[PDB]
Symmetry: C4
Subunit: 388 residues, 4 copies
Amino acid sequence: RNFNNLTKGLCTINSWHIYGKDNAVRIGESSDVLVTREPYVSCDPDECRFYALSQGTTIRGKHSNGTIHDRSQYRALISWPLSSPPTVYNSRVECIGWSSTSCHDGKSRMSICISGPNNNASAVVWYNRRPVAEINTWARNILRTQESECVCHNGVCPVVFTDGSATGPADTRIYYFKEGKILKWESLTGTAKHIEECSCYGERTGITCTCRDNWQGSNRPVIQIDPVAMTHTSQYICSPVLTDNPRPNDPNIGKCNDPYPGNNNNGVKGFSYLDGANTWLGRTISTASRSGYEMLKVPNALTDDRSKPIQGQTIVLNADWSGYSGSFMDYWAEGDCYRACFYVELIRGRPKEDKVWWTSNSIVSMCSSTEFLGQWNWPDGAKIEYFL
Amino acid sequence: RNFNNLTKGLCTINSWHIYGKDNAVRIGESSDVLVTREPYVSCDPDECRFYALSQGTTIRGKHSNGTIHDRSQYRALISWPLSSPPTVYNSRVECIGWSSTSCHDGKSRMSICISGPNNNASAVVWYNRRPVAEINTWARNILRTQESECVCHNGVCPVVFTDGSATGPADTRIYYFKEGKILKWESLTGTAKHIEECSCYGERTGITCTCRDNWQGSNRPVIQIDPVAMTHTSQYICSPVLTDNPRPNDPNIGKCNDPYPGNNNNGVKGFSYLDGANTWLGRTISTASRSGYEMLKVPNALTDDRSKPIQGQTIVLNADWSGYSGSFMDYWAEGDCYRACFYVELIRGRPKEDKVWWTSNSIVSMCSSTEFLGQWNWPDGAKIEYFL
Amino acid sequence: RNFNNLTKGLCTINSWHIYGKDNAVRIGESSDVLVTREPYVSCDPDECRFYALSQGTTIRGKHSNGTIHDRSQYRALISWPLSSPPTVYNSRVECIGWSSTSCHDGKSRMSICISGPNNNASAVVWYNRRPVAEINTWARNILRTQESECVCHNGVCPVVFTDGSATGPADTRIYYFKEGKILKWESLTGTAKHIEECSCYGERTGITCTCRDNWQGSNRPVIQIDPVAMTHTSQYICSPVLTDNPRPNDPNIGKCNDPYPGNNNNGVKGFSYLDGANTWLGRTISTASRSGYEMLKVPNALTDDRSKPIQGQTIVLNADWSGYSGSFMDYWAEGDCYRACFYVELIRGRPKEDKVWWTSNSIVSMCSSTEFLGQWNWPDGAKIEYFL
Amino acid sequence: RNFNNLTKGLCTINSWHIYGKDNAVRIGESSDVLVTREPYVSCDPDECRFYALSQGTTIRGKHSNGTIHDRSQYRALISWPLSSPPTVYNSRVECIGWSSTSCHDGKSRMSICISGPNNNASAVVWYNRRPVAEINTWARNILRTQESECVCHNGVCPVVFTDGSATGPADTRIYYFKEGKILKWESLTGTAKHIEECSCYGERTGITCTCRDNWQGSNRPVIQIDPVAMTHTSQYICSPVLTDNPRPNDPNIGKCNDPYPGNNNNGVKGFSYLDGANTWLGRTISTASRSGYEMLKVPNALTDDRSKPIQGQTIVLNADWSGYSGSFMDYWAEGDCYRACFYVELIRGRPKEDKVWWTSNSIVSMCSSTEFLGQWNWPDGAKIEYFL
Ligand SMILES: *[C@@H]1O[C@H](CO)[C@@H](O[C@@H]2O[C@H](CO)[C@@H](O[C@@H]3O[C@H](CO[C@H]4O[C@H](CO[C@H]5O[C@H](CO)[C@@H](O)[C@H](O)[C@@H]5O)[C@@H](O)[C@H](O[C@H]5O[C@H](CO)[C@@H](O)[C@H](O)[C@@H]5O)[C@@H]4O)[C@@H](O)[C@H](O[C@H]4O[C@H](CO)[C@@H](O)[C@H](O)[C@@H]4O[C@H]4O[C@H](CO)[C@@H](O)[C@H](O)[C@@H]4O[C@H]4O[C@H](CO)[C@@H](O)[C@H](O)[C@@H]4O)[C@@H]3O)[C@H](O)[C@H]2NC(C)=O)[C@H](O)[C@H]1NC(C)=O
Ligand SMILES: *[C@@H]1O[C@H](CO)[C@@H](O[C@@H]2O[C@H](CO)[C@@H](O[C@@H]3O[C@H](CO[C@H]4O[C@H](CO[C@H]5O[C@H](CO)[C@@H](O)[C@H](O)[C@@H]5O)[C@@H](O)[C@H](O[C@H]5O[C@H](CO)[C@@H](O)[C@H](O)[C@@H]5O)[C@@H]4O)[C@@H](O)[C@H](O[C@H]4O[C@H](CO)[C@@H](O)[C@H](O)[C@@H]4O[C@H]4O[C@H](CO)[C@@H](O)[C@H](O)[C@@H]4O[C@H]4O[C@H](CO)[C@@H](O)[C@H](O)[C@@H]4O)[C@@H]3O)[C@H](O)[C@H]2NC(C)=O)[C@H](O)[C@H]1NC(C)=O
Ligand SMILES: *[C@@H]1O[C@H](CO)[C@@H](O[C@@H]2O[C@H](CO)[C@@H](O[C@@H]3O[C@H](CO[C@H]4O[C@H](CO[C@H]5O[C@H](CO)[C@@H](O)[C@H](O)[C@@H]5O)[C@@H](O)[C@H](O[C@H]5O[C@H](CO)[C@@H](O)[C@H](O)[C@@H]5O)[C@@H]4O)[C@@H](O)[C@H](O[C@H]4O[C@H](CO)[C@@H](O)[C@H](O)[C@@H]4O[C@H]4O[C@H](CO)[C@@H](O)[C@H](O)[C@@H]4O[C@H]4O[C@H](CO)[C@@H](O)[C@H](O)[C@@H]4O)[C@@H]3O)[C@H](O)[C@H]2NC(C)=O)[C@H](O)[C@H]1NC(C)=O
Ligand SMILES: *[C@@H]1O[C@H](CO)[C@@H](O[C@@H]2O[C@H](CO)[C@@H](O[C@@H]3O[C@H](CO[C@H]4O[C@H](CO[C@H]5O[C@H](CO)[C@@H](O)[C@H](O)[C@@H]5O)[C@@H](O)[C@H](O[C@H]5O[C@H](CO)[C@@H](O)[C@H](O)[C@@H]5O)[C@@H]4O)[C@@H](O)[C@H](O[C@H]4O[C@H](CO)[C@@H](O)[C@H](O)[C@@H]4O[C@H]4O[C@H](CO)[C@@H](O)[C@H](O)[C@@H]4O[C@H]4O[C@H](CO)[C@@H](O)[C@H](O)[C@@H]4O)[C@@H]3O)[C@H](O)[C@H]2NC(C)=O)[C@H](O)[C@H]1NC(C)=O
Ligand SMILES: CCC(CC)O[C@@H]1C=C(C(=O)O)C[C@H](N)[C@H]1NC(C)=O
Ligand SMILES: CCC(CC)O[C@@H]1C=C(C(=O)O)C[C@H](N)[C@H]1NC(C)=O
Ligand SMILES: CCC(CC)O[C@@H]1C=C(C(=O)O)C[C@H](N)[C@H]1NC(C)=O
Ligand SMILES: [Ca+2]
Ligand SMILES: [Ca+2]
Ligand SMILES: [Ca+2]
Ligand SMILES: [Ca+2]
């Protein structure tokens, strides 16, 4: 087998079709489904799998009480087959920790997990299911990474890390790995003022990451990585179509090199595909809470600060809870181009639903089509009443 | 490996022997068995598996309440090993939707699922476990397909779709796929007046489909497809041995090019093997409800409008519930000929058994023998009392 | 790969060591373990597995009520990994029926299941997980076979069938299969007066079967099969060490060509290894019920009607329930000789324990050693109280 | 494939990172997790797995009542995937018994289980999942072995056995196996006065074992094995840093060739890595009970009777229960050196927590890093209240 090379461009995106859905909370009502959060999707050359951070307990288990908690010693990055629920019996543990990333380079899979206390966290880099390299905290304030898949080109896999305050200036680094070993790291450069939880995809030798400004911005920071030169730039999506949550209402002029103001000290992991006229943005429908999800076709959103939507598709109704969202692609599919995909985390439980004492999620997943397909909406589908 | 070619004919069918039975409802009384309906069977070159449409919940789970419902966002086409029950832990998801078909071409498996609202449904074609082609609704009225396996010849797999009214003229299309890509489609031709849920099998370069007239007929429409020329004809089974449900009593003269009247706006998925003197028809024993199942040897049923049974075998007693039935064959078995097989869906729960609030099924499956074997009857075997 | 040839002899048997134990009833108290009976063990070239007849329900499931019943449509021959319990999720179904046999020929596995009503039963022969041949009842009175593994030599696998009364003269046949196809069958010959449930093993081109006389004898009938000439002889074990159950007390003179009298119309499946001075017999400790199990070294038991034990080993205490027992060997192990093995069925529930309404079993399994090893006793270990 | 050779040395150990954690007791609160004790970790060339002695029951199962019991017929050595819990459905049984060891030689895995009554125990040696050799008790007093992995060099695998009193002089033997067959055994030599439960690792053609003196010593005996000459020596760790439990307080002078006094007739399985200046010792934090665990860097602990710690890392807080600990290494990882690993058994239930009637454990596992990583603490994480 061989190192994957990013030689293709994105397929024309004319709509989105259903790709995967696990119905985890529905099924977990009467089965041994693991409590999770921060899910994502990542492909191997022969298989696509769901990924998430387990809480080391099932939903019906009494230890699910208090799983709104983010970081603990009982968390672990798990993977399981596409569209099946994350269960005790069908889940494979990749590594131990409460923040993670993962990707296949064509030959083997690299997985990274971060664990530890807030002032002494450390990352372990696994490659081919063995631990290979370790990274200590450099700012002693919750070392953390992407919570979705990384991308590899010719065996080189860039990973975005952040260490420091979640609500002020922090220390963001881009690490370049090959076979789990560290080739290089560099401090964040460019005009982006704060970076959390980057969603990445690869196209024609370039890697694009769409991130979360948890400090002052409701526009999304963007990191463009050159995986061959191992260099990067950063800015914001210039579009006045704001895609963080919570967020102000859409203005008529966006900001390219500074945060759009109005909401401080919060955000949500999100994604975008930035491809000239083929540009699609995702966001929650609500401007106030993590409910609803929609895709919006915004031509040149990355560079045009007046750009507005010309097409869209609803993924989750506003009346239904959403959550994190992120990008992935099957880089080993057939065809001349890469088909854009994404997932949406459907959070159930706390804080929004405090009749139960747990927090979990299920997953819905979509891929692009060149057809103009009809749309549906994909709620989690569980009824809280049944869990009382 | 290679594309399968339909070079063989049917084996002489002298009786039927038991092939598979999963006892899903019995076992699901105390295990994590998924609620399903619309099951079928399909073989790979190395394995035969059960298939069905899951409801995204187990039977004991509270979310099984209301699963008489046909189309929802929690449904998915699943497969699992022959004669095992469909459980949360042993089931593999093929694709997401509430109407489906699937077949192996010798090299890889094609699976098709349809999802969406009634006026905006769309089909996704998977090949080798990756999405490859999409089809939008053309009549905006529940785009739907076979609910049993398709058949492939030299990499070409015909699939019958219907879009439009279930109780009047509708738009039926035959699609021809190769490696998941669309080669051709054509509107329904011939004398068949309404097509639903075709059951297909392949023999000596020809593909035969037996379908359901849900509009006016209680005789079954038949589609004969040429997979090399990618053309087809259609008519009804001429035999006065009527095989839909519900249905009038058997007359002495059948109809070849028009529906046999008496029952409107209903039917059931069924099958037949049409092979001259080796012709066998399946049907429910009751003329009023989905109970009982029998096989009847009706020589030249396809072309002879006076033809009557000369041999038979009871599969399910009239006192026991049945349901959908359909055809499949192991095209990779040894021997000079293909052995005819079929399955019967054994529906339990609503509407017929409303003490419970769920609807599910188990599967019984048979194959042909050249021996004259003794017969048994194969009920689902669950006791509703235990579920109260 | 190649057809296995019986070129080796038995290893010297000086004692027995523990080989496998599944603790099914213990574990099944709080897990989804399938109710079973008639278990056995059979090896592939790369794996050894447990086999049994499932009842299509778990032990905790309410449908376990009445599973003392022998023949039903919910039974199936299942296999699962050595020393694990037979669970819904880890069991593989081989075929459907209520009497069975199975063996690997070196290339692929043949499995045979019999199903149907008492007067119309039929056997289906599976080879390489596909149905290949069918056999109708010839005496219309519960067609039945070995309930333990068959043995193959150069692709030829003899199987002993019985059809007719269980308490009088019946029609016993030896079938010779190759790749699931029937080469030959012949009626029972020799001095054995009644044959049920043969336990077989292979040595130096010869196949030895030890059976159950359910009519008048408490000595065990023996069938010696030549798999190359496809011929056989039969007689009884001449030894006064009687090994059926129930049975008279041991006399000082056994019978070679007629049943030893005193107990009519009952018996239990059992086994022996007949190897001159290396001869070991198994039997229940009790002469009245299926409790206890012991191995006895009885030199020339097959031919010497005065022969008595000179060594022994207790397997199950008399205070503990036993059941069927049978022989198997790993014909693909390393070494110059075949090591003798056996299993004992540990029946729990009805009729002996009627506080519960179910009947099930677990398995204990032993193999021979050339060392003189210490002995233990291996009870099932479940407590009935917990199931109330 | 090939026999592994111990050609490498240990990597410089500057700290420890998290490797694996199964959270078995947490998860087992509402899932079918097997009750276990005496766990360990062992690697194949392509996979690392958890190992433990099952009690033949799940934690929620009523048969978990009384599982503080050490030796019974319902115990078995099981293995399951790294960091998953030991469940009924995902566990593989290696062999039957209540004391065990296991290791891969590069080609295949050898597993050894001991079973039987106290005065008649015997070991069965499995190789490539088949039984190959048997060893009878030589002192008729609980034949017992390592309870963690053995190490192989060029196909030769040394295993340390003990037979006789646990609280006085006993008969310890070192067995040398190849492909499961016995090459040689020799009685214990050197100055070590009592040997139990050796933890072993391999480095540059030498095998080091750290054991438990259950008689008079609170310093740990050490066995150094030459696997090529098949010879050994023994002594104690000279360091005044005492690593058994319970134990006196640390003095300023240790003992090299005799037990350090103060605590009799007890101990705990433990480990050490003895590598000159790269020497790390493990021990419980408490001197009185099995709570807490810490690693201490003690230069030349093996030979220097004045040596004291110069660096350390806390693994489990003193407020949390610990248990057995032992060594393992991935001998098939990439790099010029072997990375030291270990596990800690986290015992929950009896005797320390007698509100429940069961005894079980979970596992935490660590590996060495050349980075100076921040430390966390890794408790089992279950709440006993939930099990009442
Ligand atoms: C079966 O399925 C199909 C396939 O899915 C369904 O068809 C889909 O239907 C949906 C819903 O209608 C469509 O999504 C919307 O698309 C519009 C954009 O399309 C319109 O506008 C285009 C651009 O117009 C401008 O530019 C052109 C220059 O070329 C100029 O001509 C024009 O005058 C104008 O200047 C048009 O080109 C386009 O026409 C085309 O499409 C028509 C069909 O749609 C067709 O008839 C035409 O012939 C032509 O082919 C069309 O007119 C998006 O604007 C819209 O997104 C807004 O609205 C949703 C609510 O629905 C909202 O959630 C979005 O966030 C967004 O609204 C916010 O953002 C704006 C920008 O910032 C802001 O200005 C708004 O005020 C609003 O802001 C507020 O809400 C947000 C959200 O909380 C908040 O953050 C803010 O702060 C503020 O509070 C939808 O995405 C699909 O495009 C369409 N797909 C296809 C293929 O047709 C079909 O309906 C189904 N059938 C059935 C029976 O159900
Ligand atoms: C052990 O197992 C074996 C193997 O399974 C068992 O043997 C099987 O037994 C079953 C049950 O008896 C048989 O099934 C029935 O078969 C008959 C057909 O066989 C008969 O008819 C043949 C044709 O006769 C005509 O043509 C010939 C020309 O050659 C002419 O000679 C003759 O006079 C007549 O003109 C005969 O050839 C055939 O003879 C052969 O077989 C005999 C044994 O069967 C043997 O003795 C002979 O020597 C010779 O070898 C035989 O006489 C089917 O007709 C029948 O199906 C009808 O009946 C069932 C109810 O049992 C019903 O459910 C069916 O739907 C059907 O009845 C409906 O359809 C008709 C056609 O439309 C209609 O006219 C009826 O009025 C009826 O319609 C009503 O009900 C339906 C259903 O709801 C409804 O829709 C309608 O509207 C209306 O309300 C059975 O299939 C097997 O063939 C047989 N197998 C074998 C290999 O023998 C054995 O019994 C078991 N042993 C034990 C101890 O249990
Ligand atoms: C640690 O583990 C080891 C290894 O397992 C344990 O050692 C084992 O211990 C067991 C139990 O003691 C032994 O099993 C018994 O073996 C005897 C046979 O061995 C004796 O007899 C031999 C033959 O003697 C005759 O021939 C020779 C000619 O060479 C002649 O010299 C002699 O005088 C006599 O004529 C002797 O060779 C043999 O000696 C050897 O072994 C000795 C140790 O055993 C050793 O000390 C010697 O130096 C020499 O090396 C020995 O004396 C079996 O007969 C016996 O089986 C009977 O008894 C059990 C009950 O225990 C019963 O269940 C059996 O069914 C059987 O009894 C029935 O069958 C008879 C035949 O029909 C009948 O006559 C009886 O009346 C009885 O019938 C009644 O009960 C049955 C059952 O319900 C019923 O069906 C009937 O109708 C009727 O009601 C045992 O199998 C192992 O052999 C032995 N293994 C080894 C390697 O030593 C050790 O004990 C453990 N240690 C500890 C501390 O626990
Ligand atoms: C983020 O994570 C990092 C990484 O983990 C954290 O950093 C770690 O912090 C821990 C905790 O502080 C450290 O573990 C302790 O290490 C000390 C040893 O280090 C000290 O001593 C060294 C040796 O000093 C001697 O020799 C040198 C000669 O070179 C000489 O210079 C010196 O004067 C003296 O003679 C020093 O070299 C060393 O300095 C280095 O490290 C410093 C940072 O640690 C740094 O500042 C320096 O510049 C230099 O680089 C340092 O001073 C261990 O001694 C200690 O272990 C004892 O204490 C724990 C309790 O904490 C106890 O459980 C242990 O069992 C042990 O105590 C017992 O054993 C003794 C020996 O027998 C005995 O004498 C004691 O009385 C005691 O005995 C009692 O308790 C036991 C236990 O029950 C019982 O059995 C007895 O009977 C009796 O009752 C710790 O292991 C790590 O080393 C350190 N790692 C690193 C890389 O720095 C960091 O804290 C985290 N950050 C945050 C914010 O949380
Ligand atoms: C420490 C700041 C960080 C990103 C803003 O908080 C995240 C936000 C979360 C959220 O907004 O739901 C949940 C994340 N699990 C959490 N990440 C970590 C490592 O705890
Ligand atoms: C929309 C008409 C269609 C065929 C008549 O209804 C079917 C009949 C069913 C039935 O008769 O039981 C159940 C099918 N799940 C359903 N198919 C869909 C797509 O909903
Ligand atoms: C027989 C002495 C032996 C070592 C001291 O006891 C062990 C100590 C144990 C313990 O200290 O927790 C549990 C072990 N399961 C047990 N080993 C056996 C074979 O029973
Ligand atoms: Ca923000
Ligand atoms: Ca109809
Ligand atoms: Ca008898
Ligand atoms: Ca001690």
